[PDB]
Structure formats: C-alpha cells, structure tokens
Amino acid sequence: MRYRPFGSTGVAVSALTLRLADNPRLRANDWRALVFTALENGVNSFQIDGDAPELLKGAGEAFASVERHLLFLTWRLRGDAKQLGPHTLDALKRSAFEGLSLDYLDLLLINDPQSASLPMAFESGLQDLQKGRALRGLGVASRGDIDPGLLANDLVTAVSSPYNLSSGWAERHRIRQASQNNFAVIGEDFWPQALRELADVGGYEFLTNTPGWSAEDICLGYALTEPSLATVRVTADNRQEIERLAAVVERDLPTGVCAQIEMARFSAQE
Numbered sequence: 001m002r003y004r005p006f007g008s009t010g011v012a013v014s015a016l017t018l019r020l021a022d023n024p025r026l027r028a029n030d031w032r033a034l035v036f037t038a039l040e041n042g043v044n045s046f047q048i049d050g051d052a053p054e055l056l057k058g059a060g061e062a063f064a065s066v067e068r069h070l071l072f073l074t075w076r077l078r079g080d081a082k083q084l085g086p087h088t089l090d091a092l093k094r095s096a097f098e099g100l101s102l103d104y105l106d107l108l109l110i111n112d113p114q115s116a117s118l119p120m121a122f123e124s125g126l127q128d129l130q131k132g133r134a135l136r137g138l139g140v141a142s143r144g145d146i147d148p149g150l151l152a153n154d155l156v157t158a159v160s161s162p163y164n165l166s167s168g169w170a171e172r173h174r175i176r177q178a179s180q181n182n183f184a185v186i187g188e189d190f191w192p193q194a195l196r197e198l199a200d201v202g203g204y205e206f207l208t209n210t211p212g213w214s215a216e217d218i219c220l221g222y223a224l225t226e227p228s229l230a231t232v233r234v235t236a237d238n239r240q241e242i243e244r245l246a247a248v249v250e251r252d253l254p255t256g257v258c259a260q261i262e263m264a265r266f267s268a269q270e
C-alpha cells in the first residue's frame, strides 16, 4: 500500500479509501471482516456512506482494533446541502459518534450547496464540533465548479470529484486547481457501472486485451496515477475484492497501456 498527504492537513491517507454503504446482505460480522481485511492490506481511510445498525456495529468494532490516530474516517452526508440543519447534526451524533463509538471524525463530506454559504444552523453546529475537537474538517463533493467563497471557509479541507478515463477537461482542471490550492481531493467513480460500455468503443480494446490485467484494474491503476488525488474511493463486497483492489496499488501500469489510454480518445474519434 502507498500513502499520500491529505492536502495540507498534515496527515496521510492510504491511496485507496474503502466506502462502506448500507446493504442488507452484509451483517455486522461481515462488515467487521471487510474492515479487518482492508486494514490488513494497509487501507486506513474509510468512508461511511450509510447508517444501518449492522454496518455501524461491525465497522465500529473493527475500527477499535487499531489506534484511532492511524485511521482517517469520513462520514458522507447525501442530503440536499441547502436543507441541512439541526436534524442533520442530531442524526450525526446518533449514527456517527454513538453508532461508530467515535470521539471525532476526520472529515464530513457534504454536497455542493451551489453558493458561497452553508445553511446557518448547520454551519454553527459544524463550528461547535470543530471547536470541540470532534470534527477535523469539512469536504465538498462536487461535479462542477465550487464557489471560491465556500472553499475559503475555514472548515473546508477537502473536495471530492469523479475521476476516470472519461473525465473531460473541466473536471481535470477543477481537480488540479483544488490540489494546487492545498485541498485534498478524493477521487470517485474510477470505473462506475454506467461507464463500462467504454470497453466496447473502438480505441479502447486494450481495456480487455492486455495480458494480466482486467479492465477494472486498468481503470483503478489509471486513477492511481493522477497526482492531484490524495486517495481513490473504492467499494468492495467481499474480502477477495478488497485484496485485489489493494494489490493494484503496488502494480505498475504497463507503459504501452498508458500510451494507449492517452491515444484512445483520438483513436475512437477516428
């Protein structure tokens, strides 16, 4: 496993961040086993994207197996960012702090409110958590430009963005600019279900014809080569998948694959 500075916060994160999301098929013991496997492969960055009791029980128990300061724990809030408020803070206290048995979160990752300002009551609550040392930073998940006035908010330490083979110029520009301005950037959607028909496009044959590599592993390897990303979010349903994803971190993408990735759009256009 490889590790990267999380922006200018002074802490480091594994190159992969494991997303944990509600799934009735996974009970507490399964979640514990998944987190243990991730930890044993050097993943120290986890994003909780759910609030089911089985998930919180199993993940919280697994997190407790290691010293807290070695973990980077992010809580994802997917509600409409302009509607967040005291109800959100109460739920966070119940699910994240009580549910995971935590005294602090490293990051709270919200959506872009499409403005320079956050809702007042919610922001006051975040300021209380930060002053109480219960929250180290706020992150903004965006698929567009973020208002510079929101990024200038003293709470904000990070942004998240899709990043994959198909990312266009604007998405790449935003990621590079955020990183150059000392925000940590979390990559998402390295190979999302809705993009995978790319493997059928002329010019992209290498995704499925490179000896020793699968399409998904090439796409993860590509995301791992982007210097602007502090970490790449992944989801795994079983221990074998976690082991395979972590293994990609230590593989070198072949030079010929990198060349074909760079030529692929032109070849597809032609």
Ligand SMILES: Nc1nc2c(ncn2[C@@H]2O[C@@H]3COP(=O)(O)O[C@H]4[C@@H](O)[C@H](n5cnc6c(=O)[nH]c(N)nc65)O[C@@H]4COP(=O)(O)O[C@H]3[C@H]2O)c(=O)[nH]1
Pocket: 078, 079, 080, 081, 082, 111, 112, 113, 141, 142, 143, 144, 160, 161, 162, 188
């Ligand atoms: N990197 C990243 N960025 C994310 C993610 N989720 C949301 N965003 C970003 O945050 C913006 C605001 O989302 P919102 O506060 O949920 O506010 C949303 C929400 O109120 C609504 N919306 C979006 N998708 C749906 C949907 O499927 N159903 C419904 N009912 N409303 C939706 O439209 C608003 C505007 O959405 P957008 O134009 O997409 O703008 C989104 C997008 O730029 C994520 O996981 N990763």
Ligand SMILES: [Ca+2]
Pocket: 022, 050, 051, 052
């Ligand atoms: Ca839930």
Ligand SMILES: [Ca+2]
Pocket: 123, 124, 127
């Ligand atoms: Ca205030």
Ligand SMILES: [Ca+2]
Pocket: 112, 114, 115, 142, 144, 145, 146, 147
């Ligand atoms: Ca925006």
Ligand code: NA
Pocket: 047, 109, 160, 161, 186, 187, 188, 233
């Ligand atoms: Na993320």
Ligand code: NA
Pocket: 019, 188, 189, 233, 234, 235
């Ligand atoms: Na993911």
